[PDB]
Subunit: 363 residues, 2 copies
């Protein structure tokens, strides 16, 4: 029962009761705190009251299930695209879609049937060019990239990689799950913050992180991007989500277009914590605060385990990362900031990290 | 835009507004009417208020989402088993599980569910409802490899019953594993409403029971239940549940409440059958060709022999204020066109009378009777 976190009573997006202790939550991905947004709950409750617990399929001549139409329109507005397809689960979008779009080549980061897999060195623009240039020119290619790397919390040099992909006419898919609602002028993701609107073919994402519900999505401006809905070799098995789930998702997505205060709060919190932990002499994954993830690097599994324990006991919950996920000898304590964390909470978090870090011998 | 049914305003499980008309609903699979059950709604609302619109994964050693633990316990109690695995979607359970459990043979009915009718599994199709073709085809297979026979309790097309008792015994003649879909039976077949398998006294002889929350339960998702000791390993199956999501607080809450209520909903169960039998007998006494001579399930299918005629009667019925299902080949044998009624435990005896009146009126006008 490793690092099993069971949250018995949940006060808010930033605090719950874990093992009988009032604990600050700092290891979940509820970036914009939408899971408890008053309007979101209300929408969910209304949908429950008006439409009940579930509905039936109502397919309408194409893989548009009638209950997704509204949420799919919210995504169109949010991303400013013409195409939007909602999936029942995050993964049916996460990697489900890749096997759908690809004998053909799939080129993806090393630390990211019917498709030849090609792995390029992590964050290496040049290895991407080298590996791409060694491939047969005729066949169809898809390059998969992430806006934010969830491990250390750094930024992919998309602008450079995207251009290197188009050097080869390859199609580009970008995952913007860890950026939704707080990167670029409209909060569309890292791709937007780097001025790539219109140069990216497909943007995948999930409702788990910022939106705050089950499911995922793809968005595109590809004229033919409706055919996707009907892919039955790479399945269009998918369920229609219940009234409350779609209601919540829609409301949440629409609110994410205007949540300027949450967006400013998220970054303050992120920068406050990043700078703070750094000034205590912690080895962080990034020199500059690049995203909402702040990862503290430790060099000893035991030491990492103990600090986590100390932090939890002290009233703070953060993520534990280790190999296999990380490079061997790399152990991470991973903080994920919430737009709903108060400046006071961030100060308490800093106090706690100091206290714990000292006690264990990290600082 | 074929027979597209969009329900703008939904009064209850049995009536809504379709194309500006107050319409009786008789083509959905909300058998026990749980989608609007007061306790179910309440449970959903509270879970939303207490736990929010969603929670993170909280997956563990055995891929078990903490958020499913409670709903998975309800299934254990309901089916009286030790094993219960909830899935994010109906299909991840419906056929997802089959490809999971099977260079191996999968033996299934030729008309296997519109979900069932890829990879690592050699497909073997036996003649519909033919106990003997099942024996014949099974006996022609290599003895050594692992085999799974998939069967349904209720055939959704005509609304008849699989002779499970016989087929199950024929499978065990060959040591093959048995999977039974009990989606169209949940809550109203057998002493505990566990399905056709139970009504035929097969408790303990069936390896896996699959099902969905769509029909009786009244929400997204599906499940498998088992008594197999090793039936926890499945959770960690290379592809088919390490792509599963944890359902949000309101979905789980609703499902649990609904499932627990389905253990005691005796009145609903007695109402469902009355409605089913009233309709079946009634339509029959008007001279309609039904899929079954006796009322065997909650599905009552009217058989027509002409696509155009079938299409027009559906149109007439809809205009008259009734919504039923249209079935056509590819889903049916060619030249078989069905109007499929699906009874609800929440249909009043008055509504069933109105339905009969409507079917009479329409059928006459079109030329079916």
């Amino acid at each position: 029962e490793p690092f099993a976190i069971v949250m018995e009573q949940v006060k808010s997006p930033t605090e719950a009761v874990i093992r009988g202790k009032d604990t600050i939550l700092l290891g979940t991905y509820n970036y914009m705190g939408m899971t408890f947004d008053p309007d979101v709950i209300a929408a969910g409750k209304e949908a429950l009251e008006k439409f009940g617990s579930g509905t039936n399929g109502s397919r309408m001549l194409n893989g548009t299930f009638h209950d997704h139409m509204e949420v799919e329109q919210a995504l169109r507005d949010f991303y400013g695209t013409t195409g939007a397809i909602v999936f029942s689960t995050g993964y049916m979008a996460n990697l489900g879609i890749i096997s759908t779009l690809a004998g053909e080549y799939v080129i993806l980061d090393a630390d990211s049937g019917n498709a030849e897999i090609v792995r390029f060195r992590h964050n290496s623009v040049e290895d991407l060019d080298k590996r791409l240039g060694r491939l047969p020119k005729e066949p169809a290619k898809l390059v998969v990239l992430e806006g934010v790397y969830s491990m250390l919390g750094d930024i992919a040099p998309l602008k450079e990689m995207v251009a290197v992909a188009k050097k080869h006419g390859a199609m580009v898919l970008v995952d913007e799950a860890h950026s939704m609602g707080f990167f670029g002028p409209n909060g569309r993701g890292v791709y937007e913050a780097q001025g790539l609107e219109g140069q990216i073919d497909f943007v995948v994402g999930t409702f788990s992180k910022s939106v705050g519900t089950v499911g995922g999505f793809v968005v595109s401006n590809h004229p033919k991007f409706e055919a996707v809905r009907l892919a039955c070799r790479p399945y269009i098995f998918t369920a229609s989500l219940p009234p409350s789930v779609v209601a919540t998702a829609t409301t949440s997505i629409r609110k994410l277009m205007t949540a300027h205060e949450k967006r400013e709060r998220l970054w303050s919190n992120a920068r406050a914590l990043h700078g703070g932990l750094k000034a205590m002499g912690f080895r962080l994954g990034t020199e500059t605060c690049d995203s909402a993830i702040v990862a503290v690097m430790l060099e000893d599994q035991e030491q990492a385990a103990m600090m986590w324990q100390a932090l939890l006991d002290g009233g703070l919950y953060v993520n534990m990362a280790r190999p296999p996920a990380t490079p061997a000898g790399t152990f991470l304590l991973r903080c994920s900031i919430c737009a709903e964390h108060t400046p006071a909470q961030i100060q308490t978090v800093l106090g706690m990290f100091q206290a714990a870090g000292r006690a264990v011998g990290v600082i």
